[PDB]
Amino acid sequence: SDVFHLGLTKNDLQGATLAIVPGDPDRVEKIAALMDKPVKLASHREFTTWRAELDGKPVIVCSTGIGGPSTSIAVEELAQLGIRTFLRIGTTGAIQPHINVGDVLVTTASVRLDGASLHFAPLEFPAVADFECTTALVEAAKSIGATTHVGVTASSDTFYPGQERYDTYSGRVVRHFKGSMEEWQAMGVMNYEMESATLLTMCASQGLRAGMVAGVIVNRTQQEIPNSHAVKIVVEAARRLL
Amino acid sequence: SDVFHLGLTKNDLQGATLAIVPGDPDRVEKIAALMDKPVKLASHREFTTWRAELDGKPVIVCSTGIGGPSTSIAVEELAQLGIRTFLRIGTTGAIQPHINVGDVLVTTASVRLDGASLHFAPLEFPAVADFECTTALVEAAKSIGATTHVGVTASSDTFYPGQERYDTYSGRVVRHFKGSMEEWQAMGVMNYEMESATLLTMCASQGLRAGMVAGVIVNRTQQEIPMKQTESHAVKIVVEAARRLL
Amino acid sequence: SDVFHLGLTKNDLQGATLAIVPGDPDRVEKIAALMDKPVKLASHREFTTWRAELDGKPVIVCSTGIGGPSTSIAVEELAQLGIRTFLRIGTTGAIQPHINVGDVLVTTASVRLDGASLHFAPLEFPAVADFECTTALVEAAKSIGATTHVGVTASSDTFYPGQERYDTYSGRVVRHFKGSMEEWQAMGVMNYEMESATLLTMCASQGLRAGMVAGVIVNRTQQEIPNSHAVKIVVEAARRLL
Amino acid sequence: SDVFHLGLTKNDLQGATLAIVPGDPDRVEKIAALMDKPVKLASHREFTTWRAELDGKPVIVCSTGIGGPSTSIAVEELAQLGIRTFLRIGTTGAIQPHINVGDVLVTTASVRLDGASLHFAPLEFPAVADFECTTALVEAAKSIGATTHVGVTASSDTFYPGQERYDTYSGRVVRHFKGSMEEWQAMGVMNYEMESATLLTMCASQGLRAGMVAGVIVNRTQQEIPMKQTESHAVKIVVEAARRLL
Amino acid sequence: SDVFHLGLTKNDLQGATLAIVPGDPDRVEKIAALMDKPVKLASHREFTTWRAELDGKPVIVCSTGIGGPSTSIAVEELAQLGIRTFLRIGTTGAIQPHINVGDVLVTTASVRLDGASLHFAPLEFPAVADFECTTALVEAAKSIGATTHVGVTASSDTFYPGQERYDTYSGRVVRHFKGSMEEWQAMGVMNYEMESATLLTMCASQGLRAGMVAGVIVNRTQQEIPNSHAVKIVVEAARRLL
Amino acid sequence: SDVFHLGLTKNDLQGATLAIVPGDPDRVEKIAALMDKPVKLASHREFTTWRAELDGKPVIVCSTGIGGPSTSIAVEELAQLGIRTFLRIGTTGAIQPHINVGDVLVTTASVRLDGASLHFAPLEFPAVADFECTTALVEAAKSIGATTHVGVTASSDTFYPGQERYDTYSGRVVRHFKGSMEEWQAMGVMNYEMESATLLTMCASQGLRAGMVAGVIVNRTQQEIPNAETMKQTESHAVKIVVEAARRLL
Ligand SMILES: O=c1ccn([C@H]2C[C@H](O)[C@@H](CO)O2)c(=O)[nH]1
Ligand SMILES: O=c1ccn([C@H]2C[C@H](O)[C@@H](CO)O2)c(=O)[nH]1
Ligand SMILES: O=c1ccn([C@H]2C[C@H](O)[C@@H](CO)O2)c(=O)[nH]1
Ligand SMILES: O=c1ccn([C@H]2C[C@H](O)[C@@H](CO)O2)c(=O)[nH]1
Ligand SMILES: O=c1ccn([C@H]2C[C@H](O)[C@@H](CO)O2)c(=O)[nH]1
Ligand SMILES: [K+]
Ligand SMILES: [K+]
Ligand SMILES: [K+]
Numbered sequence A, C, E: 001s002d003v004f005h006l007g008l009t010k011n012d013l014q015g016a017t018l019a020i021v022p023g024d025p026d027r028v029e030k031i032a033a034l035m036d037k038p039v040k041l042a043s044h045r046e047f048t049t050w051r052a053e054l055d056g057k058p059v060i061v062c063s064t065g066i067g068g069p070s071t072s073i074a075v076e077e078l079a080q081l082g083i084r085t086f087l088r089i090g091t092t093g094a095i096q097p098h099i100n101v102g103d104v105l106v107t108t109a110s111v112r113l114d115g116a117s118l119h120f121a122p123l124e125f126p127a128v129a130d131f132e133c134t135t136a137l138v139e140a141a142k143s144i145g146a147t148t149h150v151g152v153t154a155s156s157d158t159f160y161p162g163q164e165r166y167d168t169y170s171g172r173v174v175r176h177f178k179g180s181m182e183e184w185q186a187m188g189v190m191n192y193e194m195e196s197a198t199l200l201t202m203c204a205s206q207g208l209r210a211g212m213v214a215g216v217i218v219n220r221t222q223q224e225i226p227n228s229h230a231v232k233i234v235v236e237a238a239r240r241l242l
Numbered sequence B, D: 001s002d003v004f005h006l007g008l009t010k011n012d013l014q015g016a017t018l019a020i021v022p023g024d025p026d027r028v029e030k031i032a033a034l035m036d037k038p039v040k041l042a043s044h045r046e047f048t049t050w051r052a053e054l055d056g057k058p059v060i061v062c063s064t065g066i067g068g069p070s071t072s073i074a075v076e077e078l079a080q081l082g083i084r085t086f087l088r089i090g091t092t093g094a095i096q097p098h099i100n101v102g103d104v105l106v107t108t109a110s111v112r113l114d115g116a117s118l119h120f121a122p123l124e125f126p127a128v129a130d131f132e133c134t135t136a137l138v139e140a141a142k143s144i145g146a147t148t149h150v151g152v153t154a155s156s157d158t159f160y161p162g163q164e165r166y167d168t169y170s171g172r173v174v175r176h177f178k179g180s181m182e183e184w185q186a187m188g189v190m191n192y193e194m195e196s197a198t199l200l201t202m203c204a205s206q207g208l209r210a211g212m213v214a215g216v217i218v219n220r221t222q223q224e225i226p227m228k229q230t231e232s233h234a235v236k237i238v239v240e241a242a243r244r245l246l
Numbered sequence F: 001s002d003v004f005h006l007g008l009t010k011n012d013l014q015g016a017t018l019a020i021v022p023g024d025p026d027r028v029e030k031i032a033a034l035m036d037k038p039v040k041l042a043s044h045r046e047f048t049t050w051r052a053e054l055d056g057k058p059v060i061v062c063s064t065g066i067g068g069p070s071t072s073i074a075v076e077e078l079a080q081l082g083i084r085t086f087l088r089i090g091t092t093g094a095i096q097p098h099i100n101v102g103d104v105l106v107t108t109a110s111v112r113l114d115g116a117s118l119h120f121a122p123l124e125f126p127a128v129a130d131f132e133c134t135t136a137l138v139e140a141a142k143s144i145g146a147t148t149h150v151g152v153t154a155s156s157d158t159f160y161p162g163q164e165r166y167d168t169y170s171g172r173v174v175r176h177f178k179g180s181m182e183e184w185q186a187m188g189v190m191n192y193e194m195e196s197a198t199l200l201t202m203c204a205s206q207g208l209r210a211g212m213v214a215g216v217i218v219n220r221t222q223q224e225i226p227n228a229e230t231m232k233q234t235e236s237h238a239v240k241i242v243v244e245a246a247r248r249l250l
Helices: A025-032 A068-081 A131-144 A180-186 A196-204 A229-240 B025-032 B068-080 B131-144 B180-186 B196-204 B228-244 C025-032 C068-081 C131-143 C180-186 C196-204 C229-240 D025-032 D068-080 D131-144 D180-186 D196-204 D228-244 E025-032 E068-081 E131-143 E180-186 E196-204 E229-240 F025-032 F068-080 F131-144 F180-186 F196-204 F228-248
Strands: A018-022 A036-044 A047-054 A057-062 A085-094 A104-113 A148-156 A191-193 A209-219 B018-022 B036-044 B047-054 B057-062 B085-094 B104-113 B148-156 B191-193 B209-219 C018-022 C036-044 C047-054 C057-062 C085-094 C104-113 C148-156 C191-193 C209-219 D018-022 D036-044 D047-054 D057-062 D085-094 D104-113 D148-156 D191-193 D209-219 E018-022 E036-044 E047-054 E057-062 E085-094 E104-113 E148-156 E191-193 E209-219 F018-021 F036-044 F047-054 F057-062 F085-094 F104-113 F148-156 F191-193 F209-219
Touching (some): A018 A068, A018 A229, A047 A229, A085 A131, A191 A209, A196 A209, A209 A229, B018 B228, B025 B036, B025 B228, B085 B196, B209 B228, C018 C025, C018 C229, C025 C047, C025 C229, C047 C068, C068 C196, C104 F104, D047 D228, D085 D196, D131 D228, D209 D228, E018 E025, E104 E229, F018 F228, F025 F036, F047 F228, F085 F191
Parallel strands (some): A085 A209, B018 B085, C018 C057, C085 C209, C148 C191, D018 D057, D018 D085, D104 D148, E085 E209, E104 E148, E148 E191, F148 F191
Antiparallel strands (some): A036 A047, A085 A191, B085 B191, D085 D191, E047 E057
């Protein structure tokens, strides 16, 4: 193996330069299966890698696990192997009252509520998505007719306090995040998730193209805890970026 | 007058909701003149405002002056009068050796090296341009055939130390900014300018649409201190983008 | 022209080493006219420059525009031309209930709510005025008998949120500045304006002398939006600093 | 299921209040197997959970995945199910030349180079391990005779730049971390790993007991990129400490 | 004299490598007097130094004065003289309702609300006590049967605002610390004092062993202003560390 | 006693509203003895307090010890007992080559390299002296004849690494302060000391008047440790100035 964590070699990728990067290892095979000649390559820790073919070109599907840190490992090591384009596909909680469960959200840029992004660029640097990737994602969503929102995402190193959840062991939120959800809504932020800030920052600051799309599984103006269109979209976007 | 600085009334705008915002008051009339029925509205401090017409729709052209603070006054007060879309047109100096004088830069988001943006959103919030504005700008540029770069801009509160210029009175740069250009360079940042961080942050965090386009007048990989046809390209592009956003 | 923005040459200055720097280009000629042999030198963007003579010495009057960034340009380029002493004359909003519209405020040092000052010295460095300049201004005010307050000024990169104005398009103020006016008042801060923090920091940290005086045009304990003694004072101070 | 990520119920735990939290799901079963009556409970994402028994008391073994964020999910949700003591077992790379591959490191507190800990307590709050857990870990180490170091650990959100690795795609490290390893080295810091800052801070600030132990697999004073008997030592140590904290 | 402030020579120490460091100069002799052959060595500014003998080994008692800054001088200069182990003995205000006046508090690590610690290590570095020292203190306290709490301490550069006291000349507390005591209680912090952050950080980051114990003189859930078990404990702990 | 640390009552002050505040408890009596009717009030920890009379008015002299934190206690407690003007008197080491041993420094404001000032106002607030105090100090200096420098002082919570000293147990300086002395020098900072940032910030933000003067006893840019005797005399010079300044502020 050529990389320390993923257990992959340059050769396993077979010239692939695009990766769809879901968070959950168990959803890797599922995404791969929507393409041609899906093949499992490796599985170590939270990193599960499949290779498939899309319009006759090799494409990687590799899971990041939850969070900036493991994402930063996946992305670095895939880049070493030759990946230049990363499409992230996630689940997310919407924080605006007009976004519905099942809606698709495309992130133009992220509020950096993470630690890992600071390891690539200082805070003033925008966690901005690649324009071609964003365009591909928006356009893909248009063509499958999914209801889509485009805008800014709050990207948090935690699922609980950083997203201002109060149903927790302690029931408290640190001073810094008390009242934070409401500030982000006032600023038009669409949703919370946990990886985009890292992904976008590490890519934007290293010449790698990244885009970001998520399916809404809960609306935070209703509920803290949650009770496929996006997967179709990310694959179709990959198709346009090949 | 309905606003404190611009010396304009809601009426003067005639239902305009889009503004082209150059930095220089003297450049305002030139831009308005590319459109129909250009009329001077007002001129106070660095804020010169003309109204014109584009495919029969009223459009504002308004100068920001240099820097976030004055930009923030013009944007706020325009927003009060009904503007909802802001297209910035500028000059800039590239910091990438592949970008040439004459090229056009469309900013997706900015490195926030300014003070005003912090007055609208904390630092972690992205100084990101509106997707539709960026699209219109990129498409306008394609349509007139300019060689174009799309990416990140470093937006500084100073022309000198914040852009790591050493050829100054003191000849020196504060510790924080020493070696900073080389860092932005490695991170793929295209250029320095002085207003976008404020503009993009204040718009993105208040439901206002903003976009940024600039023509390259100098390249820092050869010179610190700094062609008329280059800003003619950029102006043409911004006006054409306005057309698509109406 | 010897400088990139002001369109002036060393020669235009005629040995001048002192500049009165108002914010508004339209008030430059007005100030120059209080001195002898006033002459327009240049006008570019927000930078309008006149030269005049005071007790037989050449003096510059040059506008900064609104805000640290354009101020930093004017001051840098005037320094390059040989100016060593900067007197700022502005308009301001008082935030103490006992300071009246028409009162003259002399800044000893500023609360740095700007970005540009950080490009000259880190935050811990005081935005302090020069002692000779402050003395001149205080003494000038005494001799024309204007009612004067001497003390600390909050210098803000914005006119709206940074000065906690709520009559705005959005009607909100970012968390950081919510309740900030009241903190500054409790701390004895006299007023808000937008340039001193930049001016004072850039000069104090480069061996340039700077002083700062403003006429109060609104009292913020009453109003957000506003409805010449100071000009006389700045000129008279210049006279003592020659 | 009672918790959103782990896929467990309060019942599955059978009154367990202590959890051993390795990073790697694949290591969970190995650890459980050193105890009595090991049973797989659940496996979702990077979270694999086994239950076992230690001196007749139920004990949880549950993987965190790599990094503070997923760690914080595991710990929060385990806390919701009744766990009050967390023992982390890891692999690490030492940055002191006197610490050898094979040595065991017990962390008293961590340099907080992570994002998640800030979600529980501001930066000035110490990422400090629980005194009893640290004592149990040190005593367990002594009892099996491993050569042990007790001290401060640097806990980074990245494996690469945050640990000042240059042998990467870009070959560069952000200004903030340039020269950082030499600083931690001078300050007596033993090693880099990626979870403890989050773990220790979130437990220390919520009345939960946490401890940290790792086996040294590589030494940075010779190599960036990286024996089976070393982690066998550390695992033996963590289980024995668990025994003493029951 | 070998050091700039303490007026001591290597030789005065007679091979001592452990120092008990109280805050108050007047309490130095008192502590020394609990050991054998107590001898006054020096007295300059807030730094009073006695030497005594404990189980036939020389031991220093040296006062730090109040606050990180003077502490940092004492510790640095003692270290130059050969001290490698520092045991702090202080008075403190408890902020948990269950901790009583007279109780003994052993600090595992401190919330760094001081300035001096940042001069040794950046804020992300833990103000953690040495494990052997903490063990010695805890065990000492067990053996003399004093009622003891072990945990985190908030260490503040001020006695008034940084500990959220309101009975002051001004009666205000700066925004940053408004509501701070309650946050620290929620987080399990036991108490306020003023030196541990500096001591623990400067020691932990230079290979010096440090421990921290204090007797509770006020409970802040009742009172702002206050109306020997700890001294016995620090001495006994020194004994175990020799 | 009316205050927790100083062991003073409002009555002890006899209506005093000005205090001279040196660093060292042992210099308090010496300063007070320059004035009339000097009397010891109290002595607890590093806080020694004498009262004297200047042109018929009662005046306090009170030591702060070293550093923001204790200064903060003394100023607060003095303020509660009715003090409204604080004059800091010290000795210091210059970092500018033109400033000589023997010179006198009046500080207009300080670089805040301390912790305690943040407990009073956020970092952006200037650690600035009161204008009347600074004027009185500069004018006192001019009247007794000192060669005076007026400007910015760097106020540090440590004597060693924060002042960039490498002659230490560890011989190293934290990243933040590495190369910092050269930066302050380039920015015209006159000297380092250890209390002004706290004092000036806590006063300027609470309607208290503060000022500071110091004699130069050493210069970091030259070699040349002067002398025990030249240090004693420079110190007397500066004390003479603060007292004379106190006169003008009464
Ligand atoms: O409300 C929600 C729903 C989903 N996620 C994300 C991204 C992360 O990997 C994982 C946590 O459930 O899914 C959230 O952060 N918040
Ligand atoms: O190198 C350059 C060229 C242009 N500008 C910008 C934006 C600002 O208003 C003005 C200064 O020349 O133009 C720069 O900042 N840097
Ligand atoms: O309340 C007020 C009145 C005036 N100004 C200032 C300085 C700036 O250039 C311009 C904006 O009105 O005037 C303020 O900041 N606040
Ligand atoms: O040099 C090393 C060796 C191991 N780890 C850790 C903790 C993290 O979960 C995972 C990454 O390899 O192992 C490091 O961070 N750095
Ligand atoms: O509530 C209290 C009681 C005592 N001390 C401390 C430590 C410092 O040296 C001195 C100041 O009173 O005593 C406090 O900080 N807070
Ligand atoms: K993970
Ligand atoms: K301007
Ligand atoms: K002290």
